[PDB]
Amino acid sequence: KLLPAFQNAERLLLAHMMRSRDVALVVQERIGGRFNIEEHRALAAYIYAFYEEGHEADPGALISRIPGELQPLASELSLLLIADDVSEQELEDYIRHVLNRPKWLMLKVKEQEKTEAERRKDFLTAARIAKEMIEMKKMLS
């Protein structure tokens, strides 16, 4: 099965920052992380530290100070199909998928509010909730 965009966006971003400290610094200010997936936040931390010590673009030396449990992931990403020169729009696109992922998750709170209304036959409430959710969805895509 194919991975969701936000996840691909995190992986690709990681794949790039592992080979470019120029990109690693941009992601540090723009994204915490703030990465959505734990393992990705974990790698992020280890990638950030790599420059905040001195070390430059070298995926060889990185996969050796990483706590072994993450190694398999860093290994996988360092082989992912990437042209090592990210475009201006690409970062905006990737970062945007990561930054408003939590926002898509906010929807599911209202999705339950809606279905519960629906269960107790409070339909106009349920519709109103759905009407709000469409606005929130437009706000993101």
Partner: protein, 420 residues
């Protein structure tokens, strides 16, 4: 089975209405509730239409209310279901296309239904026959007259557009907002050729489309501080410089072709070269380039020296993405994308079919070579009245500005177009 249907398209139509209430107008024009194959969708479309006829806003709430009052909410899947429809539409603006797909599949179901009905009657009533054949004629025709056609544009409305055109042609003042052409009368109408515009200059062979494009490219580069990129696919770089040297310094072309050069015709040549050397003219005389090559070269140029115009010596010579009807459309579409990317006017010469002679060129003459008509925001035809060394430049299409005929004079001896 299974009956022609498009649940996906049905879902996108109803979804569209929930995202933009304006989507219901185009949808109701093309469809009635019974066109929907799925009962829930019929009930839903019907609820929308009812709400709309009351002059009440059509959205998730009022459709929910409507269906609850007609006891149809649960039956169509509830509010939750109206939500899903809203998530099933790739783009609300594409609602007509989704609608047409639904309609198409409805028409097919009616074809199948009436055809079957005729077949059945053939076995049963047997009986009459003459009536049978007539009603079989009748019933089949009825299937076609169902699709949303029309409407006729009324003459009053066109007269308005016609008069408003005549307004623009005289209201013509006077600033050149785009790239000046050097032909003041063409600049009045265009203003002149503008950034991001795809300009198509079509003309039958011997009319002088190549000379026209070169004159423009020459005027831009020598007069303004802008760079022009010329792609000559039928003519070499030197063969083309020969023609703009003549045009520049007023040197008889045939005279150069035969070595003959009067002492001062030679001094005429050195001034042409001197003035032409300062111009930003970049020529690629690659025999049959693909659009990607054109695009890549222009790309590098704009960020290396800056770019102002792109001229391509006839489009039917550009080879496609592979190794012609559909192929030309993609090239057309690609040239427009080229214009938008580099924020530059792209002048693509086009050849006309042998229809002009079968009648003054019009849109249908490139329509058999389309769909360049759609992509071009400006389509120009060159027509010579005497095939008076005067030539007509018919601007058949212009997205922002008037439509009419600008007139210039052609001088064979120098291969030039001059004002009037």
């Amino acid at each position: 089975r299974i009956p022609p249907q498009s649940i996906e398209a049905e879902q996108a139509v109803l979804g569209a209405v929930f995202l933009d209430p304006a989507a219901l107008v185009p949808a109701s024009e093309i469809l009635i509730p019974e066109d929907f194959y799925r009962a829930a969708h019929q009930k839903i479309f019907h609820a929308m239409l009812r709400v709309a006829d009351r002059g009440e806003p059509v959205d998730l709430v009022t459709v929910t209310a409507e269906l609850a009052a007609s006891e149809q909410l649960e039956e169509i899947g509830g509010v939750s279901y109206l939500s899903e429809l809203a998530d099933a539409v790739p783009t609300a603006a594409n609602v007509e296309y989704y609608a047409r797909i639904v309609e198409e599949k409805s028409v097919l179901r009616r074809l199948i239904r009436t055809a079957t009905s005729i077949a059945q009657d053939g076995y049963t009533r047997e009986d009459e026959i003459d009536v049978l054949l007539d009603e079989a004629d009748r019933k089949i025709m009825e299937v076609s007259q169902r699709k949303h056609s029309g409407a006729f544009k009324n003459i009053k409305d066109i007269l308005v557009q016609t008069y408003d055109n005549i307004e623009m042609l005289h209201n013509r003042d006077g600033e050149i907002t785009g790239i000046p052409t050097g032909f003041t009368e063409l600049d009045r109408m265009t203003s002149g050729f503008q950034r991001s515009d795809l300009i198509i200059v079509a003309a039958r062979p011997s009319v002088g489309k190549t000379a026209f494009a070169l004159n423009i490219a020459q005027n831009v580069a020598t007069k303004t501080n802008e760079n022009v990129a010329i792609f000559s696919l039928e003519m070499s770089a030197q063969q083309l410089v020969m023609r703009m040297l003549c045009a520049e310094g007023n040197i008889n072309a045939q005279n150069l072709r035969t070595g003959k050069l009067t002492p001062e015709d030679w001094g005429k040549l050195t001034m042409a070269m001197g003035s032409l050397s300062n111009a930003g003219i970049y020529i690629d005389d690659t025999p049959s380039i693909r659009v990607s090559d054109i695009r890549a070269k222009c790309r590098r140029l704009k960020q290396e020296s800056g770019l102002g115009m792109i001229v391509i010596d006839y489009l039917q010579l550009i080879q496609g993405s592979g190794r012609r009807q559909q192929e030309v459309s993609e090239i057309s579409r690609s040239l427009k994308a080229l214009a938008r990317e580099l924020e530059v006017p792209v002048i693509a010469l086009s050849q006309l079919s042998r229809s002009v002679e079968q009648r003054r060129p019009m849109m249908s003459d490139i329509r058999e070579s389309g769909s360049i008509e759609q992509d071009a925001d400006i389509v120009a035809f060159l027509y010579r009245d005497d095939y008076k060394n005067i030539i007509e430049i018919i601007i058949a299409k212009q997205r922002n500005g008037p439509v009419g005929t600008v007139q210039l004079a052609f001088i064979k001896e120098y291969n030039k177009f001059v004002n009037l």
